[PDB]
Design a protein around this ligand. Structure first.
Ligand SMILES: [Mg+2]
Ligand SMILES: [Mg+2]
Ligand SMILES: [Mg+2]
Ligand SMILES: [Mg+2]
Ligand SMILES: [Mg+2]
Ligand SMILES: [Mg+2]
Ligand SMILES: [Mg+2]
Ligand SMILES: [Mg+2]
Ligand SMILES: [Mg+2]
Ligand SMILES: [Mg+2]
Ligand SMILES: [Mg+2]
Ligand SMILES: [Mg+2]
Ligand SMILES: [Mg+2]
Ligand SMILES: [Mg+2]
Ligand SMILES: [Mg+2]
Ligand SMILES: [Mg+2]
Ligand SMILES: [Mg+2]
Ligand SMILES: [Mg+2]
Ligand SMILES: [Mg+2]
Ligand SMILES: [Mg+2]
Ligand SMILES: [Mg+2]
Ligand SMILES: [Mg+2]
Ligand SMILES: [Mg+2]
Ligand SMILES: [Mg+2]
Ligand SMILES: [Mg+2]
Ligand SMILES: [Mg+2]
Ligand SMILES: [Mg+2]
Ligand SMILES: [Mg+2]
Ligand SMILES: [Mg+2]
Ligand SMILES: [Mg+2]
Ligand SMILES: [Mg+2]
Ligand SMILES: [Mg+2]
Ligand SMILES: [Mg+2]
Ligand SMILES: [Mg+2]
Ligand SMILES: [Mg+2]
Ligand SMILES: [Mg+2]
Ligand SMILES: [Mg+2]
Ligand SMILES: [Mg+2]
Ligand SMILES: [Mg+2]
Ligand SMILES: [Mg+2]
Ligand SMILES: [Mg+2]
Ligand SMILES: [Mg+2]
Ligand SMILES: [Mg+2]
Ligand SMILES: [Mg+2]
Ligand SMILES: [Mg+2]
Ligand SMILES: [Mg+2]
Ligand SMILES: [Mg+2]
Ligand SMILES: [Mg+2]
Ligand SMILES: [Mg+2]
Ligand SMILES: [Mg+2]
Ligand SMILES: [Mg+2]
Ligand SMILES: [Mg+2]
Ligand SMILES: [Mg+2]
Ligand SMILES: [Mg+2]
Ligand SMILES: [Mg+2]
Ligand SMILES: [Mg+2]
Ligand SMILES: [Mg+2]
Ligand SMILES: [Mg+2]
Ligand SMILES: [Mg+2]
Ligand SMILES: [Mg+2]
Ligand SMILES: [Mg+2]
Ligand SMILES: [Mg+2]
Ligand SMILES: [Mg+2]
Ligand SMILES: [Mg+2]
Ligand SMILES: [Mg+2]
Ligand SMILES: [Mg+2]
Ligand SMILES: [Mg+2]
Ligand SMILES: [Mg+2]
Ligand SMILES: [Mg+2]
Ligand SMILES: [Mg+2]
Ligand SMILES: [Mg+2]
Ligand SMILES: [Mg+2]
Ligand SMILES: [Mg+2]
Ligand SMILES: [Mg+2]
Ligand SMILES: [Mg+2]
Ligand SMILES: [Mg+2]
Ligand SMILES: [Mg+2]
Ligand SMILES: [Mg+2]
Ligand SMILES: [Mg+2]
Ligand SMILES: [Mg+2]
Ligand SMILES: [Mg+2]
Ligand SMILES: [Mg+2]
Ligand SMILES: [Mg+2]
Ligand SMILES: [Mg+2]
Ligand SMILES: [Mg+2]
Ligand SMILES: [Mg+2]
Ligand SMILES: [Mg+2]
Ligand SMILES: [Mg+2]
Ligand SMILES: [Mg+2]
Ligand SMILES: [Mg+2]
Ligand SMILES: [Mg+2]
Ligand SMILES: [Mg+2]
Ligand SMILES: [Mg+2]
Ligand SMILES: [Mg+2]
Ligand SMILES: [Mg+2]
Ligand SMILES: [Mg+2]
Ligand SMILES: [Mg+2]
Ligand SMILES: [Mg+2]
Ligand SMILES: [Mg+2]
Ligand SMILES: [Mg+2]
Ligand SMILES: [Mg+2]
Ligand SMILES: [Mg+2]
Ligand SMILES: [Mg+2]
Ligand SMILES: [Mg+2]
Ligand SMILES: [Mg+2]
Ligand SMILES: [Mg+2]
Ligand SMILES: [Mg+2]
Ligand SMILES: [Mg+2]
Ligand SMILES: [Mg+2]
Ligand SMILES: [Mg+2]
Ligand SMILES: [Mg+2]
Ligand SMILES: [Mg+2]
Ligand SMILES: [Mg+2]
Ligand SMILES: [Mg+2]
Ligand SMILES: [Mg+2]
Ligand SMILES: [Mg+2]
Ligand SMILES: [Mg+2]
Ligand SMILES: [Mg+2]
Ligand SMILES: [Mg+2]
Ligand SMILES: [Mg+2]
Ligand SMILES: [Mg+2]
Ligand SMILES: [Mg+2]
Ligand SMILES: [Mg+2]
Ligand SMILES: [Mg+2]
Ligand SMILES: [Mg+2]
Ligand SMILES: [Mg+2]
Ligand SMILES: [Mg+2]
Ligand SMILES: [Mg+2]
Ligand SMILES: [Mg+2]
Ligand SMILES: [Mg+2]
Ligand SMILES: [Mg+2]
Ligand SMILES: [Mg+2]
Ligand SMILES: [Mg+2]
Ligand SMILES: [Mg+2]
Ligand SMILES: [Mg+2]
Ligand SMILES: [Mg+2]
Ligand SMILES: [Mg+2]
Ligand SMILES: [Mg+2]
Ligand SMILES: [Mg+2]
Ligand SMILES: [Mg+2]
Ligand SMILES: [Mg+2]
Ligand SMILES: [Mg+2]
Ligand SMILES: [Mg+2]
Ligand SMILES: [Mg+2]
Ligand SMILES: [Mg+2]
Ligand SMILES: [Mg+2]
Ligand SMILES: [Mg+2]
Ligand SMILES: [Mg+2]
Ligand SMILES: [Mg+2]
Ligand SMILES: [Mg+2]
Ligand SMILES: [Mg+2]
Ligand SMILES: [Mg+2]
Ligand SMILES: [Mg+2]
Ligand SMILES: [Mg+2]
Ligand SMILES: [Mg+2]
Ligand SMILES: [Mg+2]
Ligand SMILES: [Mg+2]
Ligand SMILES: [Mg+2]
Ligand SMILES: [Mg+2]
Ligand SMILES: [Mg+2]
Ligand SMILES: [Mg+2]
Ligand SMILES: [Mg+2]
Ligand SMILES: [Mg+2]
Ligand SMILES: [Mg+2]
Ligand SMILES: [Mg+2]
Ligand SMILES: [Mg+2]
Ligand SMILES: [Mg+2]
Ligand SMILES: [Mg+2]
Ligand SMILES: [Mg+2]
Ligand SMILES: [Mg+2]
Ligand SMILES: [Mg+2]
Ligand SMILES: [Mg+2]
Ligand SMILES: [Mg+2]
Ligand SMILES: [Mg+2]
Ligand SMILES: [Mg+2]
Ligand SMILES: [Mg+2]
Ligand SMILES: [Mg+2]
Ligand SMILES: [Mg+2]
Ligand SMILES: [Mg+2]
Ligand SMILES: [Mg+2]
Ligand SMILES: [Mg+2]
Ligand SMILES: [Mg+2]
Ligand SMILES: [Mg+2]
Ligand SMILES: [Mg+2]
Ligand SMILES: [Mg+2]
Ligand SMILES: [Mg+2]
Ligand SMILES: [Mg+2]
Ligand SMILES: [Mg+2]
Ligand SMILES: [Mg+2]
Ligand SMILES: [Mg+2]
Ligand SMILES: [Mg+2]
Ligand SMILES: [Mg+2]
Ligand SMILES: [Mg+2]
Ligand SMILES: [Mg+2]
Ligand SMILES: [Mg+2]
Ligand SMILES: [Mg+2]
Ligand SMILES: [Mg+2]
Ligand SMILES: [Mg+2]
Ligand SMILES: [Mg+2]
Ligand SMILES: [Mg+2]
Ligand SMILES: [Mg+2]
Ligand SMILES: [Mg+2]
Ligand SMILES: [Mg+2]
Ligand SMILES: [Mg+2]
Ligand SMILES: [Mg+2]
Ligand SMILES: [Mg+2]
Ligand SMILES: [Mg+2]
Ligand SMILES: [Mg+2]
Ligand SMILES: [Mg+2]
Ligand SMILES: [Mg+2]
Ligand SMILES: [Mg+2]
Ligand SMILES: [Mg+2]
Ligand SMILES: [Mg+2]
Ligand SMILES: [Mg+2]
Ligand SMILES: [Mg+2]
Ligand SMILES: [Mg+2]
Ligand SMILES: [Mg+2]
Ligand SMILES: [Mg+2]
Ligand SMILES: [Mg+2]
Ligand SMILES: [Mg+2]
Ligand SMILES: [Mg+2]
Ligand SMILES: [Mg+2]
Ligand SMILES: [Mg+2]
Ligand SMILES: [Mg+2]
Ligand SMILES: [Mg+2]
Ligand SMILES: [Mg+2]
Ligand SMILES: [Mg+2]
Ligand SMILES: [Mg+2]
Ligand SMILES: [Mg+2]
Ligand SMILES: [Mg+2]
Ligand SMILES: [Mg+2]
Ligand SMILES: [Mg+2]
Ligand SMILES: [Mg+2]
Ligand SMILES: [Mg+2]
Ligand SMILES: [Mg+2]
Ligand SMILES: [Mg+2]
Ligand SMILES: [Mg+2]
Ligand SMILES: [Mg+2]
Ligand SMILES: [Mg+2]
Ligand SMILES: [Mg+2]
Ligand SMILES: [Mg+2]
Ligand SMILES: [Mg+2]
Ligand SMILES: [Mg+2]
Ligand SMILES: [Mg+2]
Ligand SMILES: [Mg+2]
Ligand SMILES: [Mg+2]
Ligand SMILES: [Mg+2]
Ligand SMILES: [Mg+2]
Ligand SMILES: [Mg+2]
Ligand SMILES: [Mg+2]
Ligand SMILES: [Mg+2]
Ligand SMILES: [Mg+2]
Ligand SMILES: [Mg+2]
Ligand SMILES: [Mg+2]
Ligand SMILES: [Mg+2]
Ligand SMILES: [Mg+2]
Ligand SMILES: [Mg+2]
Ligand SMILES: [Mg+2]
Ligand SMILES: [Mg+2]
Ligand SMILES: [Mg+2]
Ligand SMILES: [Mg+2]
Ligand SMILES: [Mg+2]
Ligand SMILES: [Mg+2]
Ligand SMILES: [Mg+2]
Ligand SMILES: [Mg+2]
Ligand SMILES: [Mg+2]
Ligand SMILES: [Mg+2]
Ligand SMILES: [Mg+2]
Ligand SMILES: [Mg+2]
Ligand SMILES: [Mg+2]
Ligand SMILES: [Mg+2]
Ligand SMILES: [Mg+2]
Ligand SMILES: [Mg+2]
Ligand SMILES: [Mg+2]
Ligand SMILES: [Mg+2]
Ligand SMILES: [Mg+2]
Ligand SMILES: [Mg+2]
Ligand SMILES: [Mg+2]
Ligand SMILES: [Mg+2]
Ligand SMILES: [Mg+2]
Ligand SMILES: [Mg+2]
Ligand SMILES: [Mg+2]
Ligand SMILES: [Mg+2]
Ligand SMILES: [Mg+2]
Ligand SMILES: [Mg+2]
Ligand SMILES: [Mg+2]
Ligand SMILES: [Mg+2]
Ligand SMILES: [Mg+2]
Ligand SMILES: [Mg+2]
Ligand SMILES: [Mg+2]
Ligand SMILES: [Mg+2]
Ligand SMILES: [Mg+2]
Ligand SMILES: [Mg+2]
Ligand SMILES: [Mg+2]
Ligand SMILES: [Mg+2]
Ligand SMILES: [Mg+2]
Ligand SMILES: [Mg+2]
Ligand SMILES: [Mg+2]
Ligand SMILES: [Mg+2]
Ligand SMILES: [Mg+2]
Ligand SMILES: [Mg+2]
Ligand SMILES: [Mg+2]
Ligand SMILES: [Mg+2]
Ligand SMILES: [Mg+2]
Ligand SMILES: [Mg+2]
Ligand SMILES: [Mg+2]
Ligand SMILES: [Mg+2]
Ligand SMILES: [Mg+2]
Ligand SMILES: [Mg+2]
Ligand SMILES: [Mg+2]
Ligand SMILES: [Mg+2]
Ligand SMILES: [Mg+2]
Ligand SMILES: [Mg+2]
Ligand SMILES: [Mg+2]
Ligand SMILES: [Mg+2]
Ligand SMILES: [Mg+2]
Ligand SMILES: [Mg+2]
Ligand SMILES: [Mg+2]
Ligand SMILES: [Mg+2]
Ligand SMILES: [Mg+2]
Ligand SMILES: [Mg+2]
Ligand SMILES: [Mg+2]
Ligand SMILES: [Mg+2]
Ligand SMILES: [Mg+2]
Ligand SMILES: [Mg+2]
Ligand SMILES: [Mg+2]
Ligand SMILES: [Mg+2]
Ligand SMILES: [Mg+2]
Lengths: 77, 45, 60, 102, 92
RNA sequence: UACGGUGCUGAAGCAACAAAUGCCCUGCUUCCAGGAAAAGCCUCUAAGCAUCAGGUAACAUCAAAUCGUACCCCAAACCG
RNA sequence: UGAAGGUGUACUGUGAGGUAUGCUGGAGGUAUCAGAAGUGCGAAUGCUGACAUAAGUAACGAUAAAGCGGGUGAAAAGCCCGCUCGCCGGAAGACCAAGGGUUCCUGUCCAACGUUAAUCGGGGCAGGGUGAGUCGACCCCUAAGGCGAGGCCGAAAGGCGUAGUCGAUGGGAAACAGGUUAAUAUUCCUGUACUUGGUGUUACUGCGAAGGGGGGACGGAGAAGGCUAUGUUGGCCGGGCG
RNA sequence: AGGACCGAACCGACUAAUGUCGAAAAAUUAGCGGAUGACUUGUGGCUGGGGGUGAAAGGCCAAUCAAACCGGGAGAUAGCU
RNA sequence: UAAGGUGAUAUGAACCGUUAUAACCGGCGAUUUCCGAAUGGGGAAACCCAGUGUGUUUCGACACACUAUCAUUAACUGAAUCCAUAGGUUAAUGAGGCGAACCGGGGGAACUGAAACAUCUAAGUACCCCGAGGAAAAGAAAUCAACCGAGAUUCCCCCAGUAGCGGCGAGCGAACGGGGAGGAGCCCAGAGCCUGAAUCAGUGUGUGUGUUAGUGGAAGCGUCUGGAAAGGCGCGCGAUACAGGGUGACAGCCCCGUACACAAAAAUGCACAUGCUGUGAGCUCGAUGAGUAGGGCGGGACACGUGGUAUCCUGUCUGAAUAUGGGGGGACCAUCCUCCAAGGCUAAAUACUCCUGACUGACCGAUAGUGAACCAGUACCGUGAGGGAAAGGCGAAAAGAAC
């Protein structure tokens, strides 16, 4: 499903409002991309489905620090 | 003269049987309902 | 009878089961259907006496 | 803890046979005794083909309610209530007024 | 060879005309058996309990009749009968 | 003879001709619109096995369980 | 020493009503003054049950057709038996699959069911009846398709689908003739057979797959030959002499 | 050879009469069209409701169709009877 | 407990018992076919087909156990590759499903109202989905007050149909503050001396209780009417028992109960001494939660429809200061006041009743009351989902009518 592995951002619902304030239901999807991260800890590439924010979290922290948080929840990568 | 009910026990059970109801979540709710109502014939079987 | 049967050997208590089954139950079951049997109460008390034995030999 | 029971001389308190006495033949689960020589009902017994076939009217002894009878004292000479007490280890019955054991 | 259980197979000897005509002329015995009861288990039972030489057992399942009792309908139990042929050494 | 039938025998028991929409024919000729699959079956070897187990044949022998089997079935028994 | 209810009668109030009492009924009823309402029915093509009307009217379900004698019975157009007659006969006959699920057969019973009567019945009530190595199912294999470990995808539910596993309407081993029951028979019986396995025995020898190859294994139409089921006519055998 | 011809089975349904509280909620009787093909039929699949399917009539989707059926929102709403 | 029993229609038959292993009734046990999450594989549920390992076997074959999937954990054995890693086995252990309402979250209508209708309403309602638990959720202030002070949450009553919001229409609708119910707090983001101590929880046992069997339990007679007396009539008597029910008509005293007094071999709901596998009291140095707060864009939640809109939530793009610091006080600013976000865990008051008891009705009394007083979710209807009836009373006693 369209869920970021890092942040847990998933598709939220909301209205899409017109000029005459016609409320029509929609979905905000997150900006997901399958990306390959080089884990220097064990010398390999790890493919994760992350949001564009996710990438910034992985860049702010360490990929290994993020994988530590991922492995604690009981996920795969 | 060629009426709507043209019986066939295979078709009957494949379409409406216990296992056919057990296969699907909606079908399991049918059984759940008939049990809740308290029917003798839970499915045609 | 349960109190008397409770004090018996594990191998020896089978012989009573096999005796209760061999004749008595089978014999009366075959004799009842043929119309030769007058005493119908015997069919029950044997069936209970089996249950008794089979319960008593469930010692492990 | 039944007050009226099998081998017991009773007297009738109510009914067409008020004041008559007799022994109980068998108390029933519904709460009714069959006392001998009390409710004589004249049944028309139909001659059933199988077994005996007499073909005649018979005076059967019908049931009566337990509460309509009371155990006879054989001392005061009248009906009397029944109690319960523990004389020795076992439980036993007794007469109310003139406390004697049965 | 399957002791104790063999005793529970044979229920009763069957009484009928067809049952009678197959006593003398065909040398068989008809009898009501357990709803389980395989041809081997019937044969093996007759071989020990009745103690006679069995040629072969033919078996069939009789369906219960739908009877009445005023209002509430009721079906009888599906019993199973066994035509057991015997050898030349026969009796009952 | 129970006027139901029960139980004994029992002769000839051949030839020609005609003939299918059946069978040979899952064949043959032909046409194109070019006409399932997969096991059983037969065969060849790998990983192995090598007096062996395994195959082959032949005289055996033991087996072949379970369920359906009544009756209607172009109909008074199914669908109306 | 007879309540409510039912049903009559007699008084009584301006009305909704009230009072008394006869019969039926066979056990509950309730003054007064207060309180609370599922509080009053003729209509709603109202809703349920009962009963009328049309009316002893239409109809009794193919125009294939009956007739008579005897039987049984309380009773016979209808049932049983007999003799004629008629009708179907590529069916209105005989086997099955599907679908029914005891309707089959015997004995007994006609209240209801049967568009009439009914002794008869697919009706009631008992009892009886379905016998398989070879027929079919189950089983080995697959089509369409279904399910689907992981997997990919999807807010959740779940969708798709791979290795697999199901799925016949298709492919894969073998039994026939006769006799038999009131009711089963390729199943019972008699006479002849056959097919796959295990476990032996033996002489003889390379066996062995989740693998390779072969086979299974295939359309329409047409034509022709050879046959057979089957028929017809002779002969033959038993009876017949109008 | 043939979406060839005549014509039974089979599939159909042009005309007429009967029937119209029917024998039958679409039939019967007499004629009628196709009948080796775009044929017909058995068995089993698949397609689902703004959806399917449709040699297209708004046809058909269980005697129901310009939006099936069953349950629910639900005692919708009714300036109307 | 006990003199009667072998459930009902419902006889009858044949037999148990009768001072107690008959029956009965309770606590723990045993047995517990097949289907069903179904779990060895399959499957038209209640059927079909195995594998494996033990025992037996007289050729024929038996018997018992195990073998589903996933989620962690462990040993492992391990590809493309040098070490690995994916993988593949094995085995522990958990889960799976069902269930009336109540609870939290993920999604989420329309009819309708606005006398039309599109913002709005209906309404975060119906419904669908996920996770629960005995309750759930919330919760110890980056709260809200107004120079006064309150002190976590929750629920009830006011404030108030007020302030506001609003095609300023229809409608929606607070808070502050006050009165009540109930009250309670902690832990993490760690270094000294000193030490297992106060806290949760073992497991206990062992008292107190309760619950699941039970025991005793008072005192009325005579006449009259009648089929029958409990009735009338006249005299008694018990009452911590005149609740209620039965009994041939209306019973304090005939019977079952009732008040009351008493019970447990046993398995449980409880209520604190307390030996303890096991777990840190105190104490001070501090640290004190970054893709976060905030911002732009788009939505949503706040009574508050972007409005002059604070606050909260975020899909998207961005980005501080981090106690000399930061948040809020309804645009915003500056002074004062107040709190300390970016991590957790918490009883009670609160909601509900499929279910077990007791007790109560100015509730119904068979067209009512449940659809169902009765063998009813039955018959019957429908391919199916689903729909869904009708049908109570002889009598005190069958004495149910022999002939
Ligand atoms: Mg809207
Ligand atoms: Mg039908
Ligand atoms: Mg069919
Ligand atoms: Mg179907
Ligand atoms: Mg008296
Ligand atoms: Mg009597
Ligand atoms: Mg005692
Ligand atoms: Mg043979
Ligand atoms: Mg045979
Ligand atoms: Mg068979
Ligand atoms: Mg049958
Ligand atoms: Mg049955
Ligand atoms: Mg029977
Ligand atoms: Mg039964
Ligand atoms: Mg000869
Ligand atoms: Mg000859
Ligand atoms: Mg010729
Ligand atoms: Mg020829
Ligand atoms: Mg030919
Ligand atoms: Mg032909
Ligand atoms: Mg032919
Ligand atoms: Mg051919
Ligand atoms: Mg050798
Ligand atoms: Mg060998
Ligand atoms: Mg031989
Ligand atoms: Mg042989
Ligand atoms: Mg043999
Ligand atoms: Mg076999
Ligand atoms: Mg047949
Ligand atoms: Mg036929
Ligand atoms: Mg025919
Ligand atoms: Mg035919
Ligand atoms: Mg026919
Ligand atoms: Mg029919
Ligand atoms: Mg119909
Ligand atoms: Mg009088
Ligand atoms: Mg008087
Ligand atoms: Mg009244
Ligand atoms: Mg009156
Ligand atoms: Mg009246
Ligand atoms: Mg009258
Ligand atoms: Mg009067
Ligand atoms: Mg009278
Ligand atoms: Mg009365
Ligand atoms: Mg009364
Ligand atoms: Mg009053
Ligand atoms: Mg008044
Ligand atoms: Mg009044
Ligand atoms: Mg009214
Ligand atoms: Mg009116
Ligand atoms: Mg009226
Ligand atoms: Mg009027
Ligand atoms: Mg009016
Ligand atoms: Mg009306
Ligand atoms: Mg009216
Ligand atoms: Mg007229
Ligand atoms: Mg006329
Ligand atoms: Mg006329
Ligand atoms: Mg006429
Ligand atoms: Mg007519
Ligand atoms: Mg006519
Ligand atoms: Mg006729
Ligand atoms: Mg006609
Ligand atoms: Mg005809
Ligand atoms: Mg005629
Ligand atoms: Mg005639
Ligand atoms: Mg005649
Ligand atoms: Mg005659
Ligand atoms: Mg005559
Ligand atoms: Mg006569
Ligand atoms: Mg006669
Ligand atoms: Mg006469
Ligand atoms: Mg008559
Ligand atoms: Mg005649
Ligand atoms: Mg006639
Ligand atoms: Mg006839
Ligand atoms: Mg005739
Ligand atoms: Mg003719
Ligand atoms: Mg012909
Ligand atoms: Mg026939
Ligand atoms: Mg036949
Ligand atoms: Mg056949
Ligand atoms: Mg057949
Ligand atoms: Mg039928
Ligand atoms: Mg059949
Ligand atoms: Mg019948
Ligand atoms: Mg006869
Ligand atoms: Mg007869
Ligand atoms: Mg008659
Ligand atoms: Mg009658
Ligand atoms: Mg009669
Ligand atoms: Mg009739
Ligand atoms: Mg008649
Ligand atoms: Mg006849
Ligand atoms: Mg008959
Ligand atoms: Mg018949
Ligand atoms: Mg019959
Ligand atoms: Mg019949
Ligand atoms: Mg009857
Ligand atoms: Mg009879
Ligand atoms: Mg009988
Ligand atoms: Mg055979
Ligand atoms: Mg077979
Ligand atoms: Mg044979
Ligand atoms: Mg056959
Ligand atoms: Mg075969
Ligand atoms: Mg099988
Ligand atoms: Mg799955
Ligand atoms: Mg696996
Ligand atoms: Mg999966
Ligand atoms: Mg890909
Ligand atoms: Mg899933
Ligand atoms: Mg799917
Ligand atoms: Mg699907
Ligand atoms: Mg799939
Ligand atoms: Mg594999
Ligand atoms: Mg597949
Ligand atoms: Mg398989
Ligand atoms: Mg398969
Ligand atoms: Mg087939
Ligand atoms: Mg077939
Ligand atoms: Mg086949
Ligand atoms: Mg074959
Ligand atoms: Mg086949
Ligand atoms: Mg064959
Ligand atoms: Mg054959
Ligand atoms: Mg036949
Ligand atoms: Mg034959
Ligand atoms: Mg033979
Ligand atoms: Mg042979
Ligand atoms: Mg052979
Ligand atoms: Mg061998
Ligand atoms: Mg061999
Ligand atoms: Mg040797
Ligand atoms: Mg080789
Ligand atoms: Mg080889
Ligand atoms: Mg091979
Ligand atoms: Mg083929
Ligand atoms: Mg061809
Ligand atoms: Mg063809
Ligand atoms: Mg051609
Ligand atoms: Mg041609
Ligand atoms: Mg020729
Ligand atoms: Mg020629
Ligand atoms: Mg030639
Ligand atoms: Mg020939
Ligand atoms: Mg011919
Ligand atoms: Mg000819
Ligand atoms: Mg001639
Ligand atoms: Mg001659
Ligand atoms: Mg002449
Ligand atoms: Mg043509
Ligand atoms: Mg024709
Ligand atoms: Mg035709
Ligand atoms: Mg046809
Ligand atoms: Mg046609
Ligand atoms: Mg036409
Ligand atoms: Mg037509
Ligand atoms: Mg023509
Ligand atoms: Mg034609
Ligand atoms: Mg033409
Ligand atoms: Mg033509
Ligand atoms: Mg033509
Ligand atoms: Mg052609
Ligand atoms: Mg089909
Ligand atoms: Mg569809
Ligand atoms: Mg569309
Ligand atoms: Mg759609
Ligand atoms: Mg048009
Ligand atoms: Mg619609
Ligand atoms: Mg619509
Ligand atoms: Mg509808
Ligand atoms: Mg309405
Ligand atoms: Mg609404
Ligand atoms: Mg009991
Ligand atoms: Mg009984
Ligand atoms: Mg009795
Ligand atoms: Mg005791
Ligand atoms: Mg003892
Ligand atoms: Mg005992
Ligand atoms: Mg004891
Ligand atoms: Mg006991
Ligand atoms: Mg008991
Ligand atoms: Mg018990
Ligand atoms: Mg118990
Ligand atoms: Mg017990
Ligand atoms: Mg228990
Ligand atoms: Mg149990
Ligand atoms: Mg059980
Ligand atoms: Mg089993
Ligand atoms: Mg199971
Ligand atoms: Mg399953
Ligand atoms: Mg298991
Ligand atoms: Mg497991
Ligand atoms: Mg299984
Ligand atoms: Mg399989
Ligand atoms: Mg399974
Ligand atoms: Mg199958
Ligand atoms: Mg199955
Ligand atoms: Mg094994
Ligand atoms: Mg295991
Ligand atoms: Mg370890
Ligand atoms: Mg490792
Ligand atoms: Mg290693
Ligand atoms: Mg290498
Ligand atoms: Mg390596
Ligand atoms: Mg490696
Ligand atoms: Mg390693
Ligand atoms: Mg692994
Ligand atoms: Mg395991
Ligand atoms: Mg486990
Ligand atoms: Mg759970
Ligand atoms: Mg669960
Ligand atoms: Mg909820
Ligand atoms: Mg919440
Ligand atoms: Mg929510
Ligand atoms: Mg949500
Ligand atoms: Mg709207
Ligand atoms: Mg509107
Ligand atoms: Mg409006
Ligand atoms: Mg309105
Ligand atoms: Mg309006
Ligand atoms: Mg409008
Ligand atoms: Mg509302
Ligand atoms: Mg929402
Ligand atoms: Mg829990
Ligand atoms: Mg609780
Ligand atoms: Mg709990
Ligand atoms: Mg608790
Ligand atoms: Mg909580
Ligand atoms: Mg929380
Ligand atoms: Mg606090
Ligand atoms: Mg704090
Ligand atoms: Mg906090
Ligand atoms: Mg605080
Ligand atoms: Mg604070
Ligand atoms: Mg406040
Ligand atoms: Mg201050
Ligand atoms: Mg406050
Ligand atoms: Mg506060
Ligand atoms: Mg303070
Ligand atoms: Mg104020
Ligand atoms: Mg005010
Ligand atoms: Mg404002
Ligand atoms: Mg505006
Ligand atoms: Mg305006
Ligand atoms: Mg609102
Ligand atoms: Mg609101
Ligand atoms: Mg509102
Ligand atoms: Mg407030
Ligand atoms: Mg406040
Ligand atoms: Mg205060
Ligand atoms: Mg307080
Ligand atoms: Mg505390
Ligand atoms: Mg702390
Ligand atoms: Mg610490
Ligand atoms: Mg304890
Ligand atoms: Mg204790
Ligand atoms: Mg106590
Ligand atoms: Mg008690
Ligand atoms: Mg007592
Ligand atoms: Mg007392
Ligand atoms: Mg008198
Ligand atoms: Mg008198
Ligand atoms: Mg009186
Ligand atoms: Mg008086
Ligand atoms: Mg008095
Ligand atoms: Mg007085
Ligand atoms: Mg006095
Ligand atoms: Mg007094
Ligand atoms: Mg009182
Ligand atoms: Mg009281
Ligand atoms: Mg009291
Ligand atoms: Mg009473
Ligand atoms: Mg009375
Ligand atoms: Mg009374
Ligand atoms: Mg008195
Ligand atoms: Mg008194
Ligand atoms: Mg008295
Ligand atoms: Mg009490
Ligand atoms: Mg006290
Ligand atoms: Mg105690
Ligand atoms: Mg004790
Ligand atoms: Mg204890
Ligand atoms: Mg305990
Ligand atoms: Mg508890
Ligand atoms: Mg902090
Ligand atoms: Mg902080
Ligand atoms: Mg961090
Ligand atoms: Mg700001
Ligand atoms: Mg922000
Ligand atoms: Mg902002
Ligand atoms: Mg802002
Ligand atoms: Mg921007
Ligand atoms: Mg803007
Ligand atoms: Mg905006
Ligand atoms: Mg606006
Ligand atoms: Mg809003
Ligand atoms: Mg907004
Ligand atoms: Mg702005
Ligand atoms: Mg404004
Ligand atoms: Mg505005
Ligand atoms: Mg601010
Ligand atoms: Mg704020
Ligand atoms: Mg810092
Ligand atoms: Mg700093
Ligand atoms: Mg600030
Ligand atoms: Mg903020
Ligand atoms: Mg500020
Ligand atoms: Mg401000
Ligand atoms: Mg504020
Ligand atoms: Mg200052
Ligand atoms: Mg401060
Ligand atoms: Mg602090
Ligand atoms: Mg936040
Ligand atoms: Mg928290
Ligand atoms: Mg908690
Ligand atoms: Mg506490
Ligand atoms: Mg409560
Ligand atoms: Mg309750
Ligand atoms: Mg009431
Ligand atoms: Mg009712
Ligand atoms: Mg009434
Ligand atoms: Mg009625
Ligand atoms: Mg049905
Ligand atoms: Mg009924
Ligand atoms: Mg009545
Ligand atoms: Mg009479």
């Amino acid at each position: 499903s369209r869920v970021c592995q890092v942040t847990g951002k998933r598709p939220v619902t909301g209205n899409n409002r017109s000029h005459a304030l016609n409320a029509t239901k929609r979905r905000f999807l997150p900006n997901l991309h399958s990306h390959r991260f080089w884990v220097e800890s064990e010398k390999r590439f790890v493919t994760l489905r992350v949001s564009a924010k996710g990438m910034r979290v992985i860049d702010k922290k360490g990929i290994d620090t993020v994988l530590a948080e991922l492995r604690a929840r009981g996920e795969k990568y | 003269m060629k009426r709507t009910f043209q019986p066939s026990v295979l078709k009957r059970n494949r379409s409406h049987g216990f296992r056919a109801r057990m296969a699907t979540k909606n079908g399991r709710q049918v059984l759940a309902r008939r049990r809740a109502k308290g029917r003798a014939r839970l499915t045609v079987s | 009878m349960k109190a008397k049967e409770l004090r018996e050997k594990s191998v020896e208590e089978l012989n009573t089961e096999l005796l209760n089954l061999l004749r008595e139950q089978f014999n009366l079951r075959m004799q009842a259907a043929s119309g030769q049997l007058q005493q119908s109460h015997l069919l029950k008390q044997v069936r209970r006496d089996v249950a008794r034995v089979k319960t008593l030999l469930n010692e492990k | 803890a039944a007050k009226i029971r099998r081998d017991d001389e009773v007297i009738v308190l109510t009914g067409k046979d008020k004041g008559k006495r007799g022994k109980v033949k068998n108390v029933l689960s519904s709460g009714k005794v069959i006392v001998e020589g009390i409710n004589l009902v004249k049944k028309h017994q139909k001659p059933v083909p199988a077994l005996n076939q007499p073909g005649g009217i018979v005076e059967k002894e019908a049931a009566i309610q337990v509460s309509n009878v009371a155990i006879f004292n054989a001392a005061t000479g009248k009906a009397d209530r029944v109690g319960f007490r523990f004389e020795d280890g076992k439980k036993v019955r007794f007469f109310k007024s003139n406390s004697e054991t049965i | 060879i399957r002791e104790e259980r063999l005793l529970k197979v044979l229920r009763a000897p069957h009484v009928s005309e067809k049952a009678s005509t197959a006593m003398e002329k065909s040398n068989t015995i008809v009898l009501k058996v357990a709803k389980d009861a395989t041809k081997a288990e019937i044969k093996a039972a007759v071989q020990k309990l009745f103690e006679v030489e069995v040629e072969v057992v033919n078996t069939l399942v009789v369906k219960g009749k739908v009877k009445r009792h005023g209002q509430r309908i009721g079906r009888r139990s599906d019993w199973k009968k066994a035509y057991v042929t015997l050898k030349e050494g026969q009796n009952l």
